[model samples]
Structures are given as C-alpha cells and as structure tokens.
Target chain A: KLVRLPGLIDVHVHLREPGGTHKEDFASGTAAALAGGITMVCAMPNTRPPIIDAPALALAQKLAEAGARCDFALFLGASSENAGTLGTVAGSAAGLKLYLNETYSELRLDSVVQWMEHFETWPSHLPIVAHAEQQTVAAVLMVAQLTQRSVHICHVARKEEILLIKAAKARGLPVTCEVAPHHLFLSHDDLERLGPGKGEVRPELGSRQDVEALWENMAVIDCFASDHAPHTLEEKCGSRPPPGFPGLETMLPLLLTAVSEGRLSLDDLLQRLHHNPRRIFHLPPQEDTYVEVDLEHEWTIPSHMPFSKAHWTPFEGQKVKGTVRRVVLRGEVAYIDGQVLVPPGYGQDVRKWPQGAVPQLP
Target chain B: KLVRLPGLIDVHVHLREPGGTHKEDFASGTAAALAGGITMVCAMPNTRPPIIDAPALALAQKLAEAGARCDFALFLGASSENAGTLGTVAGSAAGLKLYLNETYSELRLDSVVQWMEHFETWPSHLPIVAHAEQQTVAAVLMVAQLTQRSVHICHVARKEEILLIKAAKARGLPVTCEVAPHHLFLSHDDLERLGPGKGEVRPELGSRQDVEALWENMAVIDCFASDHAPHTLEEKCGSRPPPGFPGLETMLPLLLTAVSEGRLSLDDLLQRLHHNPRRIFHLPPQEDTYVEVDLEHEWTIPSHMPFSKAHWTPFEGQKVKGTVRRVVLRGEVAYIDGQVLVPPGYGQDVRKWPQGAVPQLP
Candidate 1:
C-alpha cells in the first residue's frame, strides 16, 4: 500500500455566520471544505458582532456543530468591549485571536496588547494566534517580549513581514507563522483585479517578488491556513467590500499543480497543510479524513465544477494539469471520483483550548 | 505645462482582423487598445490562413486604414508557406516574425535563418522579430550572427534567455529584445490559481527571478509588448484550451499601478512603451496621439471598464491606483476620462520602414 499521509488541518477559515449569510455561512462553506479533503479548519473572529465575548463564541460553536460538514475550530477575539474577559474565554478557544491591525469596531493593536499579556498568565498552554500586519507587528513583538512562547502568527502574507517573523523566531521567540494559499498564488495584480475586497488585509496580494519569497520560506512556516474568508459575489461586487477570495476548494489542486511543476514538493505540501497545522491546533491525525491522489493522474477543470455557490473564480477559465480523485474522512470515503459522500453535519465543532486544559485565572 | 509623456506603443498584440472575428477582430481589439491609452500597436500575423504574402500584408494595411482605432503595423511571417514570398512581404511589414518556439507553428531554426538572410538582403532595412523561447535560444543566436543589424528578439520570457540576450548584446550585436507584461507580472505560482491561461503562452510565464532580471536588463530591451492574444471565455474554458490573457485594456492600468507602487518609474514605463517601440518599428511618433495621466489618481476598476468585445479580463474586478484620463490622437482628444471622443478612421497606418531610405538589394 502507498504511504498514507495524515489528514489536512487548515487552521484558518471564515464561515461567516450570525450576520453575514449572503456572502458565505457555515453550511455552504464547510461543505466545500469536506469536498476539498480538509479534516480541520479554524475560523476567524471578525464577524458582524465580532466573536469577542463568551456568548458569541458559544453561539458560533453551536452554529458550526449544527451546520458544518467537516471538523471546525474557532478563534476568540479580544475586542475593546471584552478586553478584561480574555482569560475567561481562553479555555474555550484554540487560542486568543488579536487583530493588531485596525479592523471591525475597535480591535486595533494598541488596545489588544494588554489583553495578550492578560491571556499569557492563563495556565493553559493555549497559544495566542496573531493576525500580523505592519500596524500589528508592534503588538506581536510585545507578545513575543512578554510570554514569547504564547504567540503564533496567523496568515503571514507579506514577504517583508515573513522576514520580520523569521527574525522574531531567531530571537528565541515562540512565534510560528501561517501563510494562506491565496497569498502564495496571487499577487498585487490579482488583488487589483479582486478590487473592493482589498480592505484591512495588509500585505495585500504582494509583488511576484513576495510570492517567490513565500515559496522559499515555506519550510519555516508552521501551518498553511486558508483564511477562507468567503463573501457573496454581490457583496464583494460592491464599491468597497472586504478583500478576500474563498480558497478551500482550490487549495489542494493549486498545491498539487505546484508540486507537479517542481515549485513545491509533496513533503512540504503535507507539512504546511497537514503536519504543522495538526501540531499547532493540537489535533490528532485523522486516518479517516484524508485524501490520496494518483500523483501521475492528469485531469482538466470543467467550467461548471462545483465547490461553492460563488460562480466566479480568479481561475474561472484556467486549465489545471493535475487532479485529486479520492478523499476519505473518519474511515469513510467522503469524496470519490468527483462526488462527495459525506452529507452535511458530519463536521464537528472543535474547542481551541479544550475543556479542563486551563487553570483558573487570577 | 506638464511634460506630456507619450501614452504607450505595444508592438505585440493579436489584432484579429481579416479573420478571428469571433475572438477579437481588429476594430474591437483596437478599441480596447484606445481604452488602455495605447497610441500605437503592431498586430501579429498568426491568424486563420496566417498573414503571409504581399497581398495579405496589403489587406491588413487596407483594413488598418479603414477601421483601425489606433496606429497599426504588421509583422510578416516566416512560415514554410510564406518562405518563398518573404522578400516581397518584408517590404510591406515592420519585420519578419519567426516563431522559433512551437506555440504557433513548427517553424524550426534552419528555416528561420534562411528567411532572416533573405529579409536581410532586401533593399529595405526590415528586421527579424524572432519569437525567443527556451528552444529558440540557438535560433536567436544564429540570427544575431547572420543579421546583426536588423534582428529584433520578441518576448524574452526566461532568465537564461535574458542572460543570453545580454551576452549577444555585449558582443556588439545590434539586436533588440522585448518582454511581455504577463512574463513580467505572472510567475510559476500563478499557473496554479489562474491555471492554463497563466501557463499557456510559450516560453511560459517565467519565474520571479526571470522578471527581476528582465527589469534589470530593461535598458537593453527595445520595448514592452502585450502579445495581446484575445480569446473568448469559452475558448479559454475547456480542459485543453490555449493559454493567454487579453492585455490591451489592462496594460496601462497595470503599469500605472506598478508605477504608483514604486516598482517601475514613469520614465521607465515611457522608455518601454514610447521611445523603444517607436524606434524599433520605425514608426514616427504621431504628434497628435499623445496621452497624459495624473500618475497619482487612484481608481477602482469596474466590471464594464474594458472596451473589448470578449467582455472578460484576467484583471477584471481589480482596483488600479492610477487612471489614464486623457488620450490625444493627432492633437484631437481621442479618449477622455474613460470616454472615446475622436471618431474612428482618424488613426493612420504606421510606416514599416521609411521610404526612400532603402539600400540596393544584396
């Protein structure tokens, strides 16, 4: 038998719920993930009301458990309204999520440093997942300086930002960086084409130079997250909508194509998508939720290939050279020969820090 | 008065006329050219039946005079069918277009060298636009050796190829090279997301290192061209469709965006767009068809912005920071603030090689 790899753990996704349903809700988004062979995905916290306090986190958890079709996790945010409640929610989430960049209401870097330090004292080994940007770099440095071992950089996009992360890691800081597939593929040119979606996400699709640098530094990156922020085509078509392209479905094919072309190796692909994310999210390898492709099989992308409800893709009319034919989850064939076997609700809600893992806060 | 830099001259575009009415005929393609502020464009001859002999060249000129929306020139082919008619057609064309690569046809280097010497001895100083590719390095070198003065390298798309071109230039060879916008913008990673269209062009979209090296040798490059091969979305949708992106409407905005971001300066942009192509094509600058932009005006690209009939762009939905607000053709405001003013038929066909300057046939 061929060596079976561990199921992929994508520790960043946005199943927009509670308020933004037209764009992408939990039901449709995770269904795409299950079809794409992802066993685990971590959702972001910058929703309509923002998942800052405990009530919102509980509500989000209920939605993921009820609506998802794949293993799901949520990141808890430290908002201005709930800065003092950081320790209270640290036990329920995979890690404390801080938006160092100014986003949503008042989750800027300056206001979030105090909360990061507050969560550092919690007994749980829950790492603080930081959304690093230039504005937020200072806040990440503060976390690195304080607890050092408690910070994990999320969606490391920019080339310069990756260099800074490398330097921070060299200083005995425990900051591990994550990179999204879109950042690895698209550039500022694509971002321009994806107009209206360019907001709050810095290192907005960088130059070809940035893309080259990311491929070179993939070895040091802790995990590859989708940051799968899905927005409705209608919402994204507006004059100024949030910037992002839903990437869950195309991630595997994109990486496989790269692997075939020698841009990346299969070993690195598994590390970024499977191994590292599993270690960071503290999830045991799932023998059930995984995929294996006949690495030599050649397939073409059809016009009506269904992954999500969104009709258009940056790659709408592209011809890919490789194909993924088999996906198994929980010892069941979730996807086989272009069809999905698992129905909705097969996905489960994953607690970040898990129950009984953290000690009482001061 | 602000020093009004010339708009841009894209020497490589697929103005499908006398054929390719379904993909992009000359009228619509040139309209897109005007939209992108391209003052002059040279149409490729790789159409149905292909533009080969003097009659075909005359037909292209007649069409350019009657319906073209921008200054237009033609490249004569060196295919087997057209090999006998090379000298006659060379007199009516800007250069002998030799496809050293196998993207369009199977014209090998031996045939290309034979035609290069044939065009070299013609009374007119017509150059050979060798379509440089990985396989065409030897052919480019052979042409550089035989026709030192009148050899133009088309689409220098790789790093090793650029170094080769540099070496040829160092040896006192009067060869000029051209790089496409896609070769400069798209990298190998883009092949994963944008798929085949991102990878379809021969001497395919190169590495980021190739682009940086190309930019480094920009001083030696005669001009930048679009190779604007327009294809219907349907043609590009299938599993094995040819790969290329229509670039007329996106070129200026794309370059301007690069300029605003400090990647390329306005001066460098002008060198590749205006000075270089005008010199290489031997087309005198139209004193009236100059274009002016604020170089700082930021604008979001709308879905309906392109003037091409295909109605699709790889750059659709992108936000570009700078806008080309005004375009003057022969002293008349041809395009102004996203609107066309100078009526069609006002633009003229460019002179291939200035008359009365031809030497006796060797």
Candidate 2:
C-alpha cells in the first residue's frame, strides 16, 4: 500500500529550449518531471539562444503547450538587453529572475538592482527571485536596507549563506531560500568518487563541517528543489565544462531516505520538498491533486535506471527508502502507479492560485 | 612508453587456501596479486584448515611452489595445537601471525603474551606481526616496553589508533604500522557506495575527521597493504559472509594516481609499496622484480578487469592515470607489454629471496 501527499512543484530546472534540443528539450525534461510526481516546474532561462525576452518566453510557452509532459511556467532572463523590458515581463511572470551567479547568464549586481527598481511601481504583485550568493546577498542587503521588496532565492548551496539569509529574513527583508538535494547529501569527499563530474555547480560540495552546519540550519531553508539540471555525460566529464548530474529521478528518494534516517522530519520534508516550492512560486493550489507514496519501501538504486536520455545520475547504487508512487493532478491521475498517465500535451500552463494570495507581506 | 616503479610486496593477505578455495584459492589470489604489481605476498593462515602447525605450513609452501604466480610466504598461526611447532616454522617463515580479533580462532591476552615470550627466547630476528586491537596493542606494548623484538601491526584503520601506534613507536617500542589504501581514501560515508560489503574487516572506515587525521599522519604509516581478501560477489554480497574487494590490480595505479595529484609523494609511494614491507617481513630485496608502469598513461578500470574470478572490486569505473605495462619476476618478464608471458604454473615460490637477509637496524 502507498500513501498520498499533495502535488510536487519544482521551481528550479533547466529545460534546454529551442537551440539545445540535442541535450534535452522541453519534452524529455518534463517527461522526467512527470515521472518523478512533479506536476509543475518553473524552468530556468539559460539555453543556447537563452530565454532573454518576451519572444523567447512565448516560444517556450508554445513548446510547453505542444509538448511538455507536465504543467510549466518559464522564467525570462534578466540582463542588460532585457533590463528595459523588465516591468513588461515581470507583470506576466510568477516573479522577476536575477541570475546572480556567473552560471549560464550575465545578470550582475547593477543590472539586477536597476531592473528591481523598474518593477517597483508595477501593478503586478511580483517578487524578485534573486539567485543569491555572497556578492548578490550583500548587494540585496545594501538595497533592502533602505527599501525592502519581496525576494526569493534560488538554489542556496553554501552553509555560511544560510545564516546570511536567516539574518536577512529575521530583519524582515522579504528573503526566502531553497537548498538542492545534492548540496544536502554530497560533500567535497565525493570528488574522488565522481571526479571531474563533481565540479557541477558554483560553491562545490563544502566541507563535512559545513554540510553539518547546513543540516543544522535546515529550519530556515524554505524549499528543496532538485535543480534538475541535465548534462550529457560527455559534456559533464570534460575538463573545462561545468559539472551537473541528472537528479529528477533520485530527488525525492534521496530526500526521503535522508528523512527516514533521521536527518530530517516528515513535516520538514513536506515543507522543503513540496509545500514551500508551490508557495514560493505561487502555483495554483489544486485542492483536488495529491501524491501517493510508500514512505518506507527501501531499495537500492541501480545504475542505468534513469528515465532521462542522458542516463547518468550521481545517486546510482544509493539505498533509499520512501518513494512517491502516484501523483493526482487536479483530481485526475496525472502520474499514477509509478508511471505518468497523462500524455505530453495534456499538461496545463502554470498559473498563480487565485485565492489566498498573501498580499506581499509588508 | 611505460615507466617502471619497484613492484610492491604485500605483507598482509588472506588467500583462503587448503579448504576455503571456493571463497578464494591460492591460484586466483596470486593471479590478482601479480596483476596488481605485487611481486610477493605474505599469506595469513586463517584458511578452512588453519596453517597453525609446521605440516599445514609446509602444505601451503608446497602449494605455492607448485602453482603460485608470484612469490609467497606463510605466517605461522598461534594456536594450542601448533604452539610447539612455532620454532620450526619460524626457521623458514617470513613472520609470526597472531589475531586478537575473533575470526576463525580467538586468542586471549595471556596466550599472546606467551607467544611473544616464546619468540623473545628464540631470537628469530624476525618481526612478530599482530592483527591487533587496543587490548592486543597494549599486550604487545607491555612486552616491547620490557624486551627487544620488533613488532609490525597490520591494517591500521582508525585515527586515534594510528596515533596510538605512532606514540608507541616514538617511545622506542620497535613498532611499525601499515594502512590499507581503502583506509586512506575512504570513510564511513562511503558505506553507501560500498554498502553491506563494509563488514569485510574490523575497524571499518571511520569519520571524515579520522581520514583527514590519517592523511595528516602519513609520515608515520610504514606500509600500504590492501588486506586484499577476495570473496565471490555472491559470498560478499550475501548474508553472514566476509565482504572484501580485490585490490591487487588497481592498487599501484590508484596510489600512483594519488601521488601524481600531490596527495602522496613518489618517494613515499615507493616506501609504502616496496621498501617497508621487505624490511618488516625480512624478505629478500629483489629490486629488479617490478612492474613497468607508465604514470602518464590513462586507463579506465572496468568491473571485470580484475583477473580474480570474484568478478567484483570496489574500484569499478574509476579512471586511473597510471598503467602497468609489464610485470618482471626475478630476471624474467612474467607479464610483458600488456600480456602475461609466464602462465600461472611457471611462477616461483615467494619464500626467502635469493638476495639474502635484511641488514641490522639500530
């Protein structure tokens, strides 16, 4: 017998769009998403051509409507060219995206601040989703020290920055942070096992002491996103390329395994893995949708079991307990019995729930 | 072109001969030994019929003479039935073996004290090797605290215990300690990667701080043995059985790769792999018997690469930078140009080498 939880929402993923279809396009990315019981994902804007403006965003939307296996909302890139178009895009977006790190984009401190000010007076109740770092968080503190606005941070990896975000939120600076599962479980020691591929993201696996610090400060972490970035083994294994491993399949199992082993609690797991993602992204609460999972079925993850075309994952051979078995999307079996029931085109466009919109807490 | 390093002599290995050949026999074990660039190995006497007496020791010697691929030495076991035969076996044996931990047979503190006293009177001028714990170390330390015989400890794994041995040696106790490559490179966190097979040895992978401590104290570590006790993947992966991975083929390359990365030095690499074991075990220094290894060449270690019939090793899919091109035994190229020139039967007995006995040390 399996158990049920609400629909899962992932707010950080890269669905390689129009130009890099060979790596992973919308169809394959969302198919994996649906397989993992995620009903919606807010796709990252980094790509070959990049989702820079309204035109690119529209192309993503059209593709999602035609081929996405799960409901999708896309984030438009915020950079110098699109700085002038910030308010126009922010009005229709879940939130304005500012890629603070030198990952996949060119959004820096000055341009992000300039754009944040541009959306300040818009009718849209938009929050600024800043990919926070040491420099970006420092800059955000400088700006918010004077005039505060709602801010959501994507993929917080460092232990020190957790306290930084905590202090910002305690000061009522409208900041919330998300932590990826990889950052939570793996440490720098994995470098020997994963080798060059271990260098997947900025602020690579911290020290064991730092990982313990992150676990200790998990209460302040608002969300847990897979950051389900996909890269072909060839690209990731190269000398100079950024390392990113497939995570959609192992995300829930890893977290649930951690929880089962007393590293986390079910309530906290619920907040980090599901509820908070939906809350942060302002996805419509489908009162009718929920996920059924067996919270204690322990199994060893076999290599090559990944449904992704890349067929590579960091969590291979890891023993995990607790798995999501079924996802009910709006009273329909979107994903059921460990398989996706709905066809690719049936996925809806992600929209903010109309009711209970907490008026951007003053 | 492949560069050659002086091949290693492993002083600690459990070949499981006489009766436990189904688990790991002399033929497969020595084959894996040669594959790993280990020109000689001192086999432990914990087989199905323990080699505690001179007859059992002679049987082991006879078997090695008949078909062993590399040189071999038998460590006379300390048991009630064989207590009187120790003097005779010590005349030709490499070292005397005593197990403090309960394996095939258990030895108490008083029995170990009696054995050391027996060796003290005989004055064999050979090192007394102990598979010891704190109690056993304390027992041997009691004798060394009063006597003149040298003692060598096997597979030092824990952090504090390594310090314990170092401290004992610093006090002029004539104690030398060995560490396995697994202990230097892995931690308890690796249990997820190695899994249930973790139960193969005592004092399993310690904490990250422990590994860091071992890395810091590398200067005191005398020998790097694999404790390469091969078991069938079925027996290893099965319940109530030993779980050890074969390391003979991959040991030199892995350590050489580590040396290439500056984690260890070439001088220390040669010391740990070759020089120390010969000195500790009173083996003849046959310097010309070595594997020609190219440190610049890259090789991927596949799962089935181990010539051992066990069909499983801990280091699968690991890409190592060094390659062993040829293995020379005595004056003959036993394995040459990526192929074995001398088949299994042509190999010689790894008894006292023709180079004569070790020189006296102050």
Candidate 3:
C-alpha cells in the first residue's frame, strides 16, 4: 500500500565536501538523503575547512546551494577558535556541534571548561549538538546541567549513553539525543559480515544487548539521524580505513523495516523523523514537503543502489520493506522513483526560509 | 622480600551459606580472602536466605563470627521485602546494596519508585551500594541525585560506566565505584581459555577497549573489589553455570602484575585496596592489620590452589609477580604463605567493632 508521510529530517549527517569530495559532495549527499525519504538534513562540521566561521559557513552554503538536490542546514563545528567568537554568525547555522568526545575526536574539546565556553557563547535558542559517547556524554550532561543549556547529542550508540539521556530527560534536564540507523540495525555480531575495515564506525558497534536496550527505551529516543558518514570503498577497505559508513540511502528502508516488523509505530516514526527534529532545531516548516512511500515494497538493498558517490553501503544486501516512491520538497518534485529530479541549487537553506508558512520560495 | 601494607578491603564477595555451601562457605571464603592478602571481605546478600531482614542478618553474623578467618562485614541486600522496613535494624549492617540494573538479578528491584522507596528509607549515615550497569547506573545516580545521598557503585566493568563515575566525581556528586580484577585483566578474548561456562561472569567480561578505559580512568575508581562470586566446578562446567568467578585469591596477584608491568603504582593500588575502602565504608579502625607481600615473587597461579571449595579459576595459568607471604589481623597471625592459619571465629565483624582506635578484640 502507498502512504504519505511528512518529510523526514536527519539531525546528524556528515556531508563531506570541500575537504573530501572524493568521498561525497553536496550533489551526491543530498540526492542520497532524498532517496532515503529525508527532505532536510542538518550537516555535521567535520569537513575540510571545518564550518566554524562565516567564511567556512557561507562557503558550504555556496557549495551546497549550487549543488544540493534537497534542503540542508550547515552546523558550525565547535572548535577552540569559534568558542570565543561564534556569536558573529550564530544565526547562520542550524546549531553548534561540540565534537568533544566519542570513541575519540580532535576538533574535540578536551575539557569541561571548553564545553562551558561554547555553551555560554552559542545562541541559547539554537542547540549545541554533541558527538560524545558515554564518558564524554556525561561530561556533556554535566556541562549542560551546569550551564543550563539544551543539547542534542549526536549518534548516541551505547546503552549507557542513551539511558543517561533518559535520566536527564526524566529529571527535567534540557537534553536531547538521537540514534543512528547503523547502531539500531547492526551489532558487533555483524563484524563478521562488515569485515575489519568496514566495522570501524565511530563509537564502535555495540552488542546485541545494546541494540535491545535501544529498542527497549525507544520512548527515550527523541530522533533518528542517519549519521551518514560516507567514505569511498578505497579509503574504507585500505590500511588507513576511515571510520563511518554510507547511511544516507539506507536509513529509511531500515526504519521502515523496523516499523514493518513492529519494532516501531508510524506515529513514533513521524515524531522522531519530523516532529522532534523540526522542534529541536526549530527548522522552518517546509511547504508541501512530503514523502510517498510504498509500504508493500520489499527488496534486498543492493550494493550499487545508494545515491552516495562513495559507491558502498554497510547495509548491502539487507532485506527491507518499503521504498520511497517520490518526495516533494517545498512544492517541487525533488525525488521520484529512482531519480533526483531537482537540479543543483534547487535545494534551499532551511535557516534562510521564512520562519512560518508566510511566503513563497524566491 | 616481604613488604607490609595495610589490610586490603573487598566490598563485594558472595559467601554462599544457608543455601549453597557446596560452592563457598564463610570458612573457605574468608580463608581464601586471607590467602589473597585481603584482611576484610564484605559479603553480598544474594544467598538462599537473602540478607534482607534482621533474622537473616543475624543468621549470617552468627555464621561469620564462627567461620570467618578475615575481618568481615555483611551488607543488607535491598529487596522488595526489606526496602519497606530496613530502617528497623539498619545500623547492624555495613551498608545496603541495591542489586538493580546490572546484566541481571533476582532480588533485583524492578521499578524507579521502588528504588526511590529504598533510597528514602535507608539511612543516610551509611551509603547505598549499587550493582548497577549503565542504565541502572544512571537510575542509581538519579536517585542519589534526587535524595542527595552518598553511594558506592560495585564492580564497574565497562568504559562507559567508569567514565560516567569519573564525570560524576568531577561534578561533585556523592558517588564512588569499584572495579573487579576480571574486568581489568580479562576480556572476551579469554573466553576461549576459560571455556564457555567457566567464562561466564556478571556484567559479562568487557572488550579489550573496555579494559584499557578502566586503566585510563583508574583515578576515578575508588577501590578494587573481588566481586568474588564462586560456584562449584561441577555446577560451573555443567548446564547451569553461575555467572561469577573465584576472584578473592587472584585479584592481588593480577594487580601486583599490573604494578610489576608499570601499569599502576603501588600507591594507587593501596589507595584502591586500603585507603578508599576504609574511607568509603567508614568502618572502625583495625588496630594492627597488615599483609606481607613478596613483590619479587613470580609464579604461575595453579588451578588447584584456591582455598575456596570451587576448585576452578579464571586466572588459571596466569603468571603473577606478587605473593601474600603473611597476613596479620589485629596482631594475630592470620595467614602464612599459602596457609590460612587463623581458624574459624578468628575474624570479627567490623560493624560490631568500636569506632576509631579505641578497642581491643573482645
């Protein structure tokens, strides 16, 4: 059966460009997102020239504006450089992401003082997203508590971190966290299939127990982000295998499979994909943005199907139910069947859109 | 080359009695404690009688008073039954252990409100020890935060857990935690040598990365507890293998090996074994308690040597660099080399001892 749902929002994604277009660029990345039924993506800052200042910010917007196939928002990566002066271009970003700690990071802030630094200077209305694992997650929470700031944790993997978020929410702490699709569907048990190089995603894959815990506490989960960190097959299977996987094109079908199998409900899916994300980032409501899904469609995800230029998928050969039939973004046919209909520059920066349903697209 | 240090403390051990003495009784268990250079051993409450009330408490006290070779303390186990009225005889126990939210449990309390019930009724003078893993760890922390009570976490195994403790300590939360030897020295890699059944232990053995995390954050760890849950070889190697290991006799040697390899300082070991344990428990001072260790000794731990009736060990064939040459308990020769010289009834309950340095063994 065919169903219409609100356009999906992925609050965490790495649109690697300017630095590593060999892996992905705005054109391929946005097409991948649209193919996955996601209408808008909040891009991570772990890129070349790393989005910290106005020049880098507008640079990506320029690149994405002229190349993107769907709506997008650029997040300023929290760094020591911008921790002091991010106020100049705070409004231009979807949010500030503190890559303080996960398994590890460098743009990563090392101390709580640095965390508090960004929290104090970053606009209160816009969240400070986090790419932290358990220990650093606690650090984020502690700093969040100390500074009275709202934070959206990125790609939370383990049971401990999510449950920590659960308790923080329980205690009225202004904290939010999202689950990555790879984490929800994959476990360390999949190491056999993913191979050594491909299994090296950040925060690492958790155990089956960890996966069960995520499902068990799905109510605590606020949103689902693709965490679409793509690397070319060459870079991935080589000696210096970079962490992350091609998730943009696989997140939807996997989630739809989860819903198909009764692990989630349509309402919860909409909440995570649309309601929570739109509210958390305060993303402007898109005009007539919707995804057409064929719920009865069941197929194995082939290796060559992703719109990501990386040309690889961690979810290769997965049997999934449901497929995106079409996507209408801001009253335009952006994605249809297997094609991206919109041209480069057709996608708009959501932050630049009118706050409400009060205008036409320029 | 015997070196004398303060008697080490183990806040977690299961001395099965009035239940499954076929595994370990107070006599064999405390004798094993003495063999390991531990002068004080705190027994867990998960037994047949389950020390949840005054009768069970006094029953264990009567047994330990006659059967223990090392100084002993019995912690009141938190259960649905005793949680309501534990205050009646709270002073008679060292502390309360809420066995909720680890890998698993039976006396495991189920609800958040139930945890709140126990935290509220349990006396604030003493701590509420927890056997919680990540999620429950957060629950315990939240409840501790809500009640403003001091708490000690038991046998913390994972990277996420210890780091959460680190963040909690940094936040000035009234919390402390202990690490078990198996977690520090062994990981899932050793499951081959340990065999499936014998390898089973609670909070299940973590990965190699987890062990490194524990080492990295040893400063956050308050003490080292054996978490000595022993099972008979017959039961362990059979269909119903219990989830524990015989840690009492091996923890010191493994730690000494760690020190031998420059992984830890003797100072940090003592801080974990003696200084922190005493401070956290607030126990009466023992007048003349010490253990003589042969730091230069290097020997492979043989499988058949444990004083505990369980004739199996996870540390079998481990080459340790330290030996407990002798142990003195309150001026009495309690152990010599491999022998437990102190008979049953030689050890005293610390809670029953006079506070400070004001007492003679009555």
lDDT of 1 by residue, A1-362 (tens): 22234467778887777677676777778767765667777788877667877888889888878777777778787665565566666666766677666465545545555655545554345656777775466566775566634567777777787777766544435457888877887777665555545332444677888888888766457677777777656656677666676777777777777877877656557657764565455443343355656456555644334766654455444455455566777677777766777776777665532221221211
Candidate 3 scores an iRMS of: 31.1
List the candidate 2 regions with Cα displacement exceeding 4 Å: A1-362, B106-124, B350-362
Winner of 2 and 3 under lDDT: 3
As for candidate 3, its clashing pairs are none
Docking quality category of candidate 3 according to DockQ thresholds: incorrect
Give the per-residue lDDT digits (tens) of candidate 2, residues A235-340.
Answer: 7777776656667777887887786687865546765656556545545444456666777688887664445665677776678987767776766777655566
- Consecutive 10-residue window with the lowest summed lDDT within model 2 chain A: A353-362
Give lDDT: candidate 3, residue B14: 94
Instruction: Look at candidate 1 and tell me the lDDT of residue B347.
Output: 61
Sorted on TM-score, best first, the list reads 3, 2, 1
Best by lDDT: 3
RMSD of 3: 23.2
* Model 2 per-residue lDDT at B182: 74
TM-score (0 to 1) for chain B of model 2: 0.90
Off by over 4 Å in 3: A1-362, B102-106, B356-362
Error of 2 at B87 (Å): 1.2
lDDT string for model 3 (B1-362, tens) is: 55666678888899997587988999999999999999988888888888888898989899999988888888898886667688767777778888885424347676888888888888766658988887778778999889767788999999989878777754546678999999999998999998989998879999999999998877678789999988988888999787899889999989988887878766568768875676567554466677788888889989856598887888888888888899888889999977778899898888875341111111
DockQ of 1: 0.01
